[PDB]
Design a protein around this ligand. Structure first.
Ligand code: ATP
Ligand code: ATP
Length: 1127
């Protein structure tokens, strides 16, 4: 196997394609995979087997070593000496064999994961357009992310399904004094514990899945709040929002608490089993014959080995192996989906023809396009219009071959260049998007970008052609994104060009220029099809097509339309001034014209009350498990004293469990408190201070830190308690038996501490790389999915495959480095442990072990100490991560006439002053407003009033200085509607009234007053309707009206309007102006405008530049000074 994506893919593709091609009904992915996997997997598997079997040998060697100190036979010093050497070598050898093999298995898991991802990516790009709208988008994201961190670890235990029975059979077969079947008492106990644990684990999974759903809901509300803190504070909404967080948190905790107990008992059960395998193991020796130390010591070491292979190594592989298989099956189901059918290019024609085409998207469809017919000559212009939904763009999908006809033929000449309704961001270099996938030629490039009028905006970009367009499209406005899409479609040389919604939400001035610049001249003599709403284009076009309800309304010459459907034509022409209508209005006009011319609980409470019931229930489980083991003992089918002693052990263990329950209760309580305090602290936080993270670390730390406290503190703490108790005992005993061991062990612990510290520093830094390399794999994926229509149209598939592989190689390189440093670290740790072991074995061998039982116990304690020690190393690592998280969390928590005198503001106490020494007056009830350049800090005046800035000077509102008024009422006076309107997700009643203070009747009254009554009636449920995704179903004008309704219900006196005109079309902007003037007849309205035409309705003006301002009492004085100062 290879170490890179390209090679890994070739091999997987060859086997997959060969089997898939060999069409034996249902070819399987699993077979393609075993043919890759098996020849490496099996080798690491056998090496691990050989490594593990060492544990089944070591106790035998000790029994003989112990015997050498017996008074029996002879004091063969030389044998004790050499056997001791052999024992320490067994430790060294398995260390040297096992770790490399584990590493190799992880290497394999990684290689397979990469091969699987590349296969899936290739498949998504070839999917049929029909199934494309049935496959939930969340499923493809989870298809790749769900096993991202599981698949590659899982192979580590896979060969244990195979090893486990070999070691169980051996250890069983090695039992000394086998017929007195202590073997069954032993196994019956362990077997029962294993099934108990399996069941418990299943319950754990049930809780994880349900909790995950609730987590996503909490996270969504959380980020919604974080990115809009200014509106929450401005609204003085505050604690209502805090309560929304609380209800989501409470829901998660109820589920978490139950999950926590599952984890608690799992761990205490583990402890319990330790005690009993040892206890039961000595029942033979108490029962008749008595004790033989030679055999007792040997017996216990073997018992320990069975416990671990039986209860942990085996079931871990079973669960892992099973889940891995299910994941593969899901991948296969995805791969076996209908394909995009390739278009056959030919030299049949020069034009475009459609022969009686009838077609539809899916079964059960009524949207069947009927009897579609075309004959377009080379170089002709086709203009198409019609009702929304009557195959306005679905026609294009037939043209490009995305949708097959059910009947009829489609003929085309050559290659097609397509520009979709919705622009594809293509994150990356802007020049490259314009000329993407093709050679750069300044002749053509300049001609296209100039003709498309891109220079007007692109030359303002900081790196010009090399300005990179990042995620979110932070560089371009929607009309600009559209403009680039056109330039891209045009730059590509094609025989046929398809323009989807080319008007681009652009200003009519540029719309005209682009049509003539591009449609007429740049595209001259090309075969063109335009989607359009403008009658002028139809007049110009050689062929006119109008669609309605799945069929042709009209197809032919412009004058033929008028002669054959004159009523349709006359109704449209009544709106003669179509250039004055925005696309939205043009669409409404045709839609109407065209449709008009149709042609447990009782006891749970008692369990909480009576702790004696809890004790009994704990004891009941213990009793039950021992009785079940008895059922397994009866396997022999094909004493009172023992009964008494085991009964005693059960009672003692039950009390031990009972004592620790308050810890679970305490743990849930603590994480709840921390989450709640952090939220409170962020809401009632100073402004500017949060700008240290700028919402990045705020969201990431808030989300991640809570998650780790909940999953790890309740887990790692119990392991630490058990490990701590074990080491205390181990050291105490050897220190007493032989003080030289202590002398020897002190430097050993010192060695481990130093290496650990160095390691963690570096590995913690490397961990950052996984996130850095991981994020872009998904950004790449999403971008490719949205761009699918053009990736196929322009033949760019291999370009993107190349990019995808480079991203994978980056990720794997960092992932791999992280893995490698960890493995090296663990190897070093184990070797240090191996060395002190040898030294200890010899301290005991060398000294006067004339009372041999003391020799025996030192040797077995040392031999079996390594299991606990490996856990201890890992637990210390987790602890350091937890403490670092705790610190990160802790860092956050441990006047009608408005009179402004000498006001000054900054974004920090250092930084820069965004405003200095401004004085300004607003007469009560006066309409006033602001003028200034974009980015002149317009919003910093509003924020200065809302007290969101580091500030100086005297502002008198509601008769008093801000200096004597707390933020809530100072801000309460101000009803502000920002350009970026905040929409709270949820029920409209709460969105409008998060406090529940207004009645439904009152809410409706205001909805009527502000013009939103029809809007709320339209949404099903009305007040109960749930609004989602930032108001993805609302006009931004509606969002502004919702804000208005809030301002009037809130009884604000100062109304602040942040350029409504920035986004709202005048057809509605005037409606809101009328509406608010009536609503605010007794209030003072302050407007911040971008144009003189809007500011014009104000009586007093504030003109701001360079952190200074000029106050005018008349628009004329403003204009006289503005002309002099128009700079
Ligand atoms: N792949 C698809 N499978 C099924 N239905 C589809 C698919 N793509 C689009 N549609 C739907 O079926 C119709 C297809 O027609 P088309 O895409 O031409 O509509 P349009 O008038 O261009 O749409 P709009 O302007 O609302 O975006 C639409 O009304 C749309 O809701
Ligand atoms: N708290 C802040 N800290 C740092 N920079 C800020 C802060 N608030 C805004 N800015 C920036 O400084 C300028 C402030 O001007 P303001 O926020 O009034 O701009 P605008 O013209 O309303 O901007 P837009 O059209 O992007 O909404 C902007 O150019 C913006 O990038």
């Amino acid at each position: 196997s290879a170490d890179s994506a390209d090679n890994l893919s070739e091999k997987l593709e060859r086997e997959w394609d060969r089997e898939l091609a060999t069409s034996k009904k249902k070819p399987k992915l699993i077979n393609a995979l075993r043919r890759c996997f098996f020849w490496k997997f099996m080798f690491y598997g056998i090496l691990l087997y050989l490594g593990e079997v060492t544990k089944s040998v070591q106790p035998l060697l000790l029994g003989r070593i112990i015997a050498s100190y017996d008074p029996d036979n002879s004091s063969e010093r030389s044998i004790a000496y050499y056997l001791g050497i052999g024992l320490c070598l067994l430790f060294l050898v398995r260390t040297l064999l096992i770790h490399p093999s584990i590493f190799g298995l992880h290497h394999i898991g990684m290689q397979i994961r990469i091969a699987l991802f590349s296969l899936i990516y290739k498949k998504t790009l070839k999917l049929s357009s029909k199934v494309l709208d049935k496959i939930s988008t969340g499923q493809l994201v989870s298809l790749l992310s769900n096993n991202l961190n599981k698949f590659d670890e899982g192979l580590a235990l896979a060969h244990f399904v195979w090893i486990a029975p070999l070691q169980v059979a051996l250890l069983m077969g090695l039992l000394w004094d086998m017929l007195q079947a202590s073997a069954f008492a032993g196994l019956a106990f362990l077997i029962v514990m294993a099934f108990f644990q399996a069941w418990l684990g299943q319950m754990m999974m049930k809780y994880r899945d349900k909790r995950a759903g609730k987590i996503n809901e909490r996270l969504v509300i959380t980020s919604e709040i974080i990115e809009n803190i200014q509106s929450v504070k401005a609204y003085c909404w505050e604690d209502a929002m805090e309560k929304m967080i609380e209800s989501l948190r409470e829901t998660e905790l109820k589920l978490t608490r139950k999950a926590a107990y599952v984890r608690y008992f799992n761990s205490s059960a583990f402890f319990f089993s330790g005690f009993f395998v040892v206890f039961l193991a000595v029942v033979p020796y108490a029962v008749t014959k008595g004790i033989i130390l030679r055999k007792i010591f040997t017996t216990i070491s073997f018992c320990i080995v069975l416990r671990m292979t039986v209860t942990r190594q085996f079931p871990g592989s079973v669960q892992t192996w099973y889940d891995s298989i299910g994941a593969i099956n899901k991948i296969q189901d995805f791969l076996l989906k209908e394909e995009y059918k390739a278009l056959e290019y030919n030299l049949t024609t020069t034009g475009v023809e459609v022969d009686k085409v009838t077609a539809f998207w899916d079964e059960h469809a009524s949207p069947v396009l009927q009897d579609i017919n075309f004959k377009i000559e080379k170089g002709e212009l086709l203009a198409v219009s019609g009702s929304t939904g009557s195959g306005k763009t679905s026609l294009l999908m037939l043209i490009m071959g995305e949708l097959e006809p059910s009947e009829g033929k489609i003929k085309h000449s050559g290659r097609i260049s397509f520009s979709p309704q919705v622009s594809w961001i293509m994150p990356g270099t802007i020049k490259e998007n314009i000329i993407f996938g093709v050679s750069y030629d300044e002749y053509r490039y300049k001609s296209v970008i100039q003709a498309c009028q891109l220079e007007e905006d692109i030359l303002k970009f900081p790196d010009k052609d090399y300005t990179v367009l990042g995620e979110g499209g932070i560089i371009l406005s929607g009309g600009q994104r559209a403009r680039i899409s056109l330039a891209r479609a045009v730059y590509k040389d094609a025989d046929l060009y398809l323009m989807d919604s080319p008007f681009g939400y652009l200003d009519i001035f540029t719309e005209k220029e682009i049509f003539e610049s591009c449609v007429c001249k740049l595209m001259a003599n090309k075969t063109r099809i335009l989607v359009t709403s403008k009658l002028e284009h139809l007049k110009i076009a050689d062929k006119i097509l109008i669609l309605h309800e799945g069929s042709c309304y009209f197809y032919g010459t412009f004058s033929e339309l008028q002669g054959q459907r004159p009523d349709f034509s006359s109704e449209l022409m009544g709106f003669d001034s179509f250039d004055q209508f925005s696309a939205e209005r043009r669409n409404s006009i045709i839609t109407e014209t065209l449709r008009r011319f149709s042609f447990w609980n009782t006891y749970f409470r008692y369990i909480t009350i009576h702790k004696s019931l809890i004790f009994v229930l704990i004891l009941c489980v213990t009793i039950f498990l021992l009785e079940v083991a008895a059922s397994l003992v009866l396997l022999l089918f094909l004493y009172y004293m023992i009964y008494i002693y085991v009964g005693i052990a059960d009672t003692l263990l039950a009390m031990g469990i009972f004592r620790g329950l308050p810890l679970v209760h305490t743990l849930i309580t603590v994480s709840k408190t921390l989450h709640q305090k952090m939220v409170h602290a962020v809401l009632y936080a100073p402004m500017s201070t949060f700008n240290s993270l700028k919402a990045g670390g705020i969201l990431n730390r808030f989300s991640k830190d809570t998650a780790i406290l909940d999953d790890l503190l309740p887990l790692t703490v119990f392991d630490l308690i058990q490990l701590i108790l074990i080491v205390i005992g181990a050291i105490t005993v050897v220190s007493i038996l032989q003080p030289y061991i202590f002398l020897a062990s002190v430097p050993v612990i010192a060695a481990f501490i130093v290496l650990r510290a160095y390691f963690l520093h570096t590995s913690q830094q490397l961990k950052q790389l996984e996130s850095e390399a991981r994020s872009p794999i998904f950004t790449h994926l999403v971008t490719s999915l949205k761009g699918l229509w053009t990736l196929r149209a322009f033949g760019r598939q291999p370009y993107f495959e190349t990019l995808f592989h480079k991203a994978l190689n980056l990720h794997t390189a960092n992932w791999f480095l992280y893995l490698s440093t960890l493995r090296w670290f663990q190897m070093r740790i184990e070797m240090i442990f191996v060395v002190f072991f040898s030294a200890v074995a010899f301290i005991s061998i060398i000294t006067t072990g004339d009372g041999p039982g003391r020799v025996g116990i030192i040797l077995t304690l040392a031999m079996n100490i390594m299991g606990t020690l490996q856990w201890a190393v890992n637990s210390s690592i987790d602890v350091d991560s937890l403490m670092r998280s705790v610190s990160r969390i802790f860092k956050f928590i441990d006047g009608g006439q408005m009179t402004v005198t000498d006001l000054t503001a900054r974004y920090t106490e250092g930084g820069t002053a965004v405003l200095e020494n401004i004085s300004f007056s607003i007469s009560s009830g006066q309409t006033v407003g602001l003028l200034g350049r974009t980015g002149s800090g317009k919003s910093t005046l509003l924020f200065a009033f809302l007290r969101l800035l580091n500030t100086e000077g005297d502002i008198q509102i509601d008769g008093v200085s801000w200096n004597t008024v707390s933020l809530q009422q100072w801000r309460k006076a101000f009803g502000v509607i920002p350009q970026k309107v905040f929409i709270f997700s949820g029920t409209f009643r709460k969105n409008l009234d998060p406090y529940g203070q207004w009645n439904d009747e009152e809410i409706w009254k205001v909805a009527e007053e502000v013009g939103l009554k029809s809007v709320i009636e339209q949404f099903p449920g009305q007040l109960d309707f749930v609004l989602v995704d930032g108001g993805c179903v609302l006009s931004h004008g509606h969002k502004q009206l919702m804000c208005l309704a809030r301002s009037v219900l809130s009884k604000a006196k100062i109304l602040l309007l942040d350029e409504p005109s920035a986004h709202l079309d005048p057809i509605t902007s005037q409606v809101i102006r009328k509406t608010l003037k009536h609503a605010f007849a007794d209030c003072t309205v302050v407007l911040s405008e971008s144009r003189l035409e809007a500011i014009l309705e104000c009586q007093r003006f504030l003109v701001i530049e360079d952190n200074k301002m000029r106050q005018y009492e008349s628009i004329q004085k403003l204009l006289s000074e503005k002309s002099s100062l128009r700079q």
